[PDB]
Amino acid sequence: QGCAFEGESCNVQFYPCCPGLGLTCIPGNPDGTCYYL
Structure with a gap:
């Protein structure tokens, strides 16, 4: 129901x-976890 930010599941x-x-x-x-590239 939404979208995740850096470091979040x-x-x-x-x-x-x-x-x-x-x-x-x-x-x-x-x-996963949201990871920055």
Whole structure:
């Protein structure tokens, strides 16, 4: 139901990383942590 910021848990179905911020969801399989590149 939203998007995640750096350092926050992500899930590619429910809570992808918020865009425009360099964030990748690692590992994102489907869960990860939003990491800055």
